[PDB]
Symmetry: C2
Subunit: 109 residues, 2 copies
Amino acid sequence: ATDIQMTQSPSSLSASVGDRVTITCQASQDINNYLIWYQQKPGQAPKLLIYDASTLETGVPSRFSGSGSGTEFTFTISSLQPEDLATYHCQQYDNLPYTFGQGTKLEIK
Amino acid sequence: ATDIQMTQSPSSLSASVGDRVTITCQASQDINNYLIWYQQKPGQAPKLLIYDASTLETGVPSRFSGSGSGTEFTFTISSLQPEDLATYHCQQYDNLPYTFGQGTKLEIK
């Protein structure tokens, strides 16, 4: 494919409450600044958390943060709360088709 | 797998130059009018054709059109030209993750 491949690392991860957790996302091609991070908990609507790589959405805790441009992006949770148990997916929207990562499954204990 | 499944039919097709061609896209859930059609030729970047189900993007041949709302969408080439040999894909952007169809590969007979 000339399709942009979004790959996330780690794919799975356990941490404890209070931990800073950082996960990563990699675009196979340059997607400039056009990257979403969303949170899927099971049977449930994805919550758009970051857009344009670095921009928090409204009513989104300041403990979440994205950064990066080009091909390397990063999602930090600065201090982990339990309501953070979620698969975190990345999604590019720079170039069709709009591909997304297989997720980082963030579990606890 | 509560992701929106985008389904296309036919998956390929051969038609003659001058023919009217109509291809369909089905969403597994209602996605309003938040549907793109795009064209993929091998080697080349995808070219957005239609957005919001029916709005034709600037510089796109007028013989292309889109219709439908909700779950059943349709794309039409009013009169087939040889350079329309490509695969035509639909893409939803109503809900994360933004999922897309495996395409209709159109050949010229």
